RNA sequence: AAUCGAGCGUGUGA
């Protein structure tokens, strides 16, 4: 479901919410530098953060939260 | 090309009733393909008035339809995007679901172009006394 | 040498493509013949009847 | 060879003056296309049937296992019409107008 | 050769003007790759005139569409010639007959999908073989002209460049023939005043061996010691 | 930075307002140099 | 709607007579049948797209109290809007009569000079667009292509819609 | 519990065509071991073959000889089918002068003790003059496949720009490879049966010797499995 | 210059970069579809037999242009909407378009086809294993009519 | 005629000769048709059809990368192609393709230092032929301009 | 250069579950992919050792086709089932074992007695299902040791296609391999399974080791 | 920075 996503969608909701968030969660991970739990296992960011997603720890509602406390401090 | 699915429902419910096109003793199409895919602007009724079939606001797939040639529907009427009323821009509901996709259409697919390729396309393929009943 | 497809013979109804395999094979095959009687130094009447 | 003999006769009565022109072409060209489907009906039949003895040792007939046969009727390349045309017969042709 | 043929590739052959053919019969008095001369027999003499008649042959002559025109003698010492017979098969010519390709040994079935849609499969003794490698000849200009500064020289002093590319070089900066040269290579020395290189090069992705060199000289110009 | 586009005809005074000079001589180049 | 003389029917007259269904059953189906004479399978979804862009456009036949001039031909779009104000009024709307024009003449007759130049005609489209002062908001497709800014359809839909939000 | 293969006759019918009778095998090993035997035959049997020319007076290939019946192309192209056996050595350098009115054959190289040549009769040129004198160094080398002159470049990839007449490589020395499994009237069992492999090659290689081989590169591939870690 | 630190960071952009073939015309939607490129020693692409129907191409001498998106708005929109596994079915009609045609069609119907009198008839299988063993090594035919538990 | 030639060289009569797997060596079911057929090279190879660039050339009057295979040009990215990517509602394809890939002056620099730094960005950007075509506009006789919001 | 070979760097072997191994080494020469394959696809399918039920006695039977009662399944569909019985015998060539187990409710394979010679491999395989309080079955079933498949068409009142070859499942597939320059290279990848008399790899290393003896006359 | 460019005709593939 990493290429072609349907299980993500039961997972992330609206598909142009999914691509909202892969483009912020791939600038993040390029500006941001957050370090991952994930091994890299020669594989793509995009590839390791579409994982992330369809894990389904990570919403638009919770990095709406997340930017308000980081703006917060 | 300035066509765009930009709205989710209108709620019209003007409509076209649409029969199988009959050249003789043979059907082209039946209802099914016809209606498969498409949104009802009423109640789908069982013959004999009494009991209703389907809802107007649920998106008509194959086992809807399936069940309505068990219940052997004669005539459906559908929220086509002529009688769609919505202003720029056609709304979800009057276009029907996406024959490439399989769920309802998203806000903001240009149905237009997808239109003008897919009628566009096959123009490749194209070219340059009494009436009896066969039937019981 | 080559290995074709039968499947764009009969769509494209290009058939001389057949016929003219079998007589490229039996052509060669007569070709062959004729190199196993060189390779025997067979006697010159043997080839001028062959 | 029957439907030569046939538009021979049609010749024939034409040169009795029966039919006209166009009649006759239009009858002609109506054998004609006969003379097609029967040369399509014994020759797809001919190439998907064979004589396969069976266990018992009789003859249980079968689905043949031409190759073009199994090119047409797998669909996986060509079509009636083409096998008709490279073992049966080609068939009427156009004029550089409309015309048969 | 065509195995299979149709009797119609003499005509070709012989009618296209690319088969050096024999004017007058007589008999070979010489063959050579590149000459044929022929001792031109006495039943068709005319007076006045030795009776040799001599063919020199293309050898290796960039065609209009980078091909290769190249004449192979076809006889030998001794060999009887007569009036209209071929003496240099041209390119694609075998005997005096029309040879556009080769004959190969084909089986027609499917192989996991490596023939489909019109696909081909090559066995590996073809390209062994080179039974169908073929010889490309272009050709590349290298004009001197005036400019508006000065006149432009044709000389090996090419600044910020290489020991390995003056290697190849001479007193000119032209490269000998047959020097094997790739895409970057300098065939024609020249350089602008401004200095900066103004030569012409082996274009880029092409690498091949120097055959021909020809010099057009206009009057008054001094040509130098590779020219 | 823009909406739309705005299409009209031009004033005498809104093509001078375009310009920065005005062309004289019909030559456009010199052959002797390179000079315009 | 009936027909008094046999023959060739036009499209227009049954726009016009027969009512807007009638005409785009008729163009669906006689497409449908080209198609599939054929054995091409399309849906009629996509004719029926074409024929609502090819009714766009509204004929004023009495204006009476709205902002319309009597005999012009205007977006049917801006005729639903006008009729909404007067509703939002309480006043009656306008009459109005639609049009089947062609593939051709709809693409010119649209409220965009921009496409209609850059499909046929763009000395025309020009000259009308310079003498009337036209304006061309970017809202179609052609529109924001030829600028090279994002499409209003696909991932772009949310872009414009954002722009018109914002402003 | 297996009857293990073995050489049972090597039959020399000519010097470049010789039956090899492996007797006995089982019922299945029959084909197994011709497919396999034939496929390692056709891949890696190594051999010797022209890699260099540098006749004298020649700067490339595409050039005329004085006096030579053939271009520079068709003896280049000659001498690569020329069936060389070199013994002890992976890299010779052989001479060939000649002069006068002949075809020049492979029977005229310059003779050394390292090197024979299989087939004297093989023809390389002809001359047709008799003041035409020709003369040729070949550089043969033991390889294995075919090394296309494309692909293979000098080391220090700076070589004699008038010399470097490169020549394609078929190091193969084989050239066609049947195998039959024929029933064997054996008094022991009656499922036993035994692989003839046909052979077809240049005469370069002595067919016992390139069965070894073959057996031998299987058994080190299996090695891998067979050592497994 | 070619070295092992180009083919090693070729290797790297090419896993997971989609590329957008596109055969000329561009007559449908499905003219243009994005790839996951594999590298060729050869100097043509390869392209997979069942989207030869989408781009109407057959390998006869076709020429097909070959197109990089590069930022990732673009990588993501190819991954999800341009790639021929994402899209099956024809928007014309909703029709899929991967089905197979010729050598696939042929071998299908080959491997499916009865004999009367084939070899290994009559027999009854423990399963499709059984059928694979009694097929590879030679001792049922691929026509015979047999028994078998189906699951 | 043919039949009798290929049993003159002692050849099966019917064209088609038992054939093997090179990789397994299992005899195919059905005999399979072998023989010799005369091919063609044709003038059309890969060595010369085969072509791709990256920050090539460029015209003058537009800034589009223009030409062939010859003057090392870039594919023409026609009408139709940007249909297809309508089509699909793919917007930065589009943009991409229409700003990126040809018509920008300075948003062509500033992505190539972003690409060789590893970085994605600069899409947005104005095509310069859409100015040409705005200059020879206004040099025709008609005012034509942006606005300011 | 004629002797000496590249060495393989990545030898990897990834565990599915216990019978299901994907075992695969890079680099293979050209054309030595299909050949190790094929080679070694035909030794585990025909030269593989193993035991497997050959015989089975059924009483009264005499004519064509006779039907007896009491079973919930056919006869046909009793010796199918036995057919695949996973089988080990250590000691001797032939034993007969019986089955003996009775009463209304579910049938396992671990209600037979164990034996010094001879030890189950899984005891959860069904033969049957009793159903009736007078129905009872204790039948004689012969196992024989064999190598491969011997079909029942030609040659104790019932016989029973006999699967002595352990090997369930295999397949091979040659991929493409690459290495810093060469990009010709086979890549075998061989998918295993067994019914669990032997290890899935351990009988590709048995019918390796087979094949590989078989070559032992030319061993330099 | 060295770096460079168009139209017309013609014949070809898709
Ligand atoms: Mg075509
Ligand atoms: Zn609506």
């Not at chain 7, 009495?62 to 007067?86: C, H, P, T």
Request: hydrophobic share 40%.
């Amino acid at each position: 479901a990493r290429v072609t996503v349907q299980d993500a969608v039961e997972k992330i909701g609206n598909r142009f919410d999914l691509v909202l968030v892969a483009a912020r969660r791939a600038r993040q991970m390029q500006v941001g530098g957050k370090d991952p739990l994930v091994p890299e296992e020669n594989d793509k960011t995009t590839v390791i953060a579409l994982r992330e997603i369809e894990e389904g720890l990570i919403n638009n509602q919770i990095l709406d939260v997340r930017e308000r406390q980081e703006q917060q401090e | 090309q300035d066509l765009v699915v930009t709205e989710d429902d209108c709620g019209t419910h003007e409509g076209i009733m649409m029969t199988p096109v009959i050249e003789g003793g043979d059907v082209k199409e039946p209802l099914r393909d016809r209606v498969l895919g498409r949104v009802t602007a009423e109640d789908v009724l069982k013959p004999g008035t009494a009991d209703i079939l389907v809802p107007r606001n649920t998106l008509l797939h194959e086992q809807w339809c399936d069940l309505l040639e068990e219940n052997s529907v004669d005539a459906v009427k559908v929220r086509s995007v002529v009688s769609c009323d919505t202003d720029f821009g056609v709304c979800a509901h009057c276009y029907g679901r996406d024959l490439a996709r399989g769920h309802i259409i998203n806000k903001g697919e240009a149905i237009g172009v997808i239109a003008a390729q897919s009628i566009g396309e096959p123009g490749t393929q194209l070219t340059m006394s009494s009436i009896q009943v066969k039937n019981k | 040498d080559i290995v074709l497809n039968p499947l764009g013979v009969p769509s494209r109804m290009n058939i001389g493509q057949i016929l003219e395999t079998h007589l490229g094979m039996a052509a060669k095959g007569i070709g062959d013949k004729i190199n196993a009687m060189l390779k025997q130094q067979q006697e010159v009447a043997k080839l001028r009847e062959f | 060879s029957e439907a030569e003999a046939e538009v021979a006769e049609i010749q024939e009565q034409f040169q009795s003056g029966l039919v006209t022109a166009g009649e006759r072409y239009n009858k002609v060209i109506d054998i004609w296309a006969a003379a097609n489907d029967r040369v399509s009906k014994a020759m797809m039949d001919n190439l998907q049937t064979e004589t396969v003895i069976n266990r018992d040792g009789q003859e249980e007939k079968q689905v043949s296992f031409n190759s073009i046969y199994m090119m047409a009727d797998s669909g996986a390349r060509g079509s009636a019409a083409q096998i008709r045309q490279l073992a049966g017969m080609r068939g009427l042709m156009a004029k550089p107008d409309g015309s048969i | 050769k065509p195995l299979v043929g149709t009797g119609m590739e003499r005509a070709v052959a012989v009618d296209s003007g690319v088969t050096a053919v024999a004017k007058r019969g007589g008999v070979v008095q010489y063959v050579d790759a590149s000459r044929i001369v022929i001792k031109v027999n006495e039943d068709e003499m005319y007076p006045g005139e030795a009776g040799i008649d001599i063919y020199n042959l293309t050898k290796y002559t960039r065609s209009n569409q980078n091909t290769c025109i190249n004449q192979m003698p076809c006889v030998s010492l001794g060999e009887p010639v007569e009036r209209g017979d071929v003496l240099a098969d041209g390119p694609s010519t075998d005997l005096g007959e029309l040879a556009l390709g080769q004959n190969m040994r084909v089986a027609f079935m499917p192989w996991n999908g490596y023939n489909f849609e019109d696909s081909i499969l090559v066995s590996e003794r073809v390209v062994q073989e080179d039974r169908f490698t073929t010889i490309h000849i272009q050709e590349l200009a290298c004009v001197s002209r005036d400019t508006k500064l000065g006149p432009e020289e044709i000389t090996a002093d090419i600044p910020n460049v290489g020991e390995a590319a003056l290697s190849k070089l001479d007193e000119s900066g032209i490269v000998y023939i047959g020097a094997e040269v790739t895409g970057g290579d300098i065939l024609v020395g020249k350089v602008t005043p401004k200095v900066k290189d103004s030569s012409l090069r082996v274009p880029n992705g092409v690498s091949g061996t120097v055959i021909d060199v020809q010099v057009f000289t206009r009057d008054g110009v001094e040509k130098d010691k590779r020219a | 930075e823009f909406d739309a586009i705005k299409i009209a005809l031009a004033s005498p005074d809104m093509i001078r307002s375009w310009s920065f000079g005005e062309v004289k001589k019909p030559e456009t180049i010199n052959y002797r140099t390179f000079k315009p | 709607g009936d027909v008094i003389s046999d023959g060739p029917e036009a499209p227009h007259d049954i726009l016009r007579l027969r009512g807007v269904h009638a005409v785009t059953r008729y163009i669906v189906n006689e497409v449908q049948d080209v198609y599939r004479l054929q054995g091409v399978k399309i849906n009629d979804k996509h004719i029926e797209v074409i024929v609502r862009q090819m009714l766009r456009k509204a004929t004023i036949v009495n204006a009476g109290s709205s902002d319309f001039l009597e005999g012009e031909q205007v977006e049917y779009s801006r005729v639903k809007i006008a009729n909404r104000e007067l509703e939002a009024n309480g006043k009656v709307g306008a009459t109005y009569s639609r049009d089947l024009l062609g593939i051709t003449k709809a693409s010119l007759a649209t409220e965009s000079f921009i496409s209609a130049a850059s499909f046929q005609e763009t000395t025309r489209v020009l000259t009308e667009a310079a003498v009337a002062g036209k304006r061309d908001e970017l809202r179609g497709l052609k529109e924001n292509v030829i600028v090279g800014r994002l499409i209003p359809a696909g991932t772009g839909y949310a872009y414009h819609q954002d722009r018109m939000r914002r402003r | 519990e297996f009857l293990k293969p073995r050489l049972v006759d090597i039959e020399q019918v000519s010097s470049t065509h010789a039956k090899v009778t492996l007797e006995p095998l089982e019922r299945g090993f029959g084909h197994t071991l011709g497919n396999a035997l034939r496929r390692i035959l056709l891949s890696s049997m190594p051999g010797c073959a022209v890699t260099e020319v540098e006749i004298d007076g020649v700067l490339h290939e595409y050039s005329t000889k004085e006096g030579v019946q053939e271009d520079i192309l068709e003896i280049l192209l000659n001498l690569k089918g020329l069936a060389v056996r070199v013994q002890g050595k992976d890299e010779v350098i052989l001479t060939l002068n000649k002069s006068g009115i002949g075809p020049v054959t492979a029977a005229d190289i310059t003779h050394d003790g390292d090197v024979e040549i299989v087939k004297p009769q093989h023809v390389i040129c002809h001359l047709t003059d008799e003041n035409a004198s020709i003369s040729m160094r070949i550089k043969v080398q033991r390889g294995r496949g075919y090394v296309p002159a494309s692909t293979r470049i000098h080391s220090e990839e700076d070589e004699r720009p008038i010399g470097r007449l490169l020549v394609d490589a078929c190091y193969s020395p084989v050239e066609r490879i049947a195998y039959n499994v024929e029933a064997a009237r054996v008094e022991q069992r009656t499922d036993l049966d035994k692989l003839v492999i046909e052979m077809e090659t240049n005469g370069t290689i002595d067919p016992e010797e390139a069965i070894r081989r073959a057996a031998t590169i299987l058994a080190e591939q299996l090695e891998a499995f067979v050592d497994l870690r | 210059r070619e070295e092992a630190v180009v083919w090693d960071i070729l290797d790297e952009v090419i896993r997971e970069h989609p590329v957008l073939l596109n055969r000329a015309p561009t007559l449908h939607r499905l003219g243009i579809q994005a790839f996951e490129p594999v590298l060729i020693e050869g100097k043509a692409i390869q392209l997979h037999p069942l989207v030869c129907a989408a781009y109407n191409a057959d390998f006869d001498g076709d020429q097909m242009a070959v197109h990089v998106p590069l930022t990732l708005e673009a990588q993501l929109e190819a991954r999800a909407l341009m790639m021929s596994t994402n899209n099956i079915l024809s928007p014309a009609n909703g029709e899929p378009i991967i089905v197979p045609s010729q050598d696939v069609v042929l071998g299908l119907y080959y491997m499916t086809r009865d004999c009367v009198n084939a070899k290994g008839e009559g027999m009854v299988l423990t399963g499709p294993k059984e059928a694979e063993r009694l097929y590879r090594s030679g001792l049922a035919s691929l026509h015979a009519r047999v028994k078998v538990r189906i699951t | 005629e043919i039949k009798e030639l290929l049993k003159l060289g002692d050849l099966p009569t019917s064209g088609q000769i038992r054939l093997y797997d090179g990789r397994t060596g299992e005899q195919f079911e059905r005999p399979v048709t072998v023989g010799y057929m005369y091919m063609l090279k044709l003038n059309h190879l890969v060595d010369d059809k085969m072509h791709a660039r990256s920050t090539g050339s460029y015209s003058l009057v537009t800034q589009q990368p223009l030409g062939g295979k010859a003057q090392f040009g870039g594919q023409r990215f026609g009408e139709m192609e940007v249909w297809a990517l309508e089509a699909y509602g793919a917007a930065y394809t589009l943009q991409e393709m229409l700003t990126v890939k040809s018509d920008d002056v300075n948003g062509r620099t500033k992505m190539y230092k972003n690409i060789v730094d590893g970085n994605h960005q600069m899409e947005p950007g104005m095509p310069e032929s859409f100015n040409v075509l705005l200059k020879e506009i206004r040099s025709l006789g008609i005012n034509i301009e942006l606005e300011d919001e």
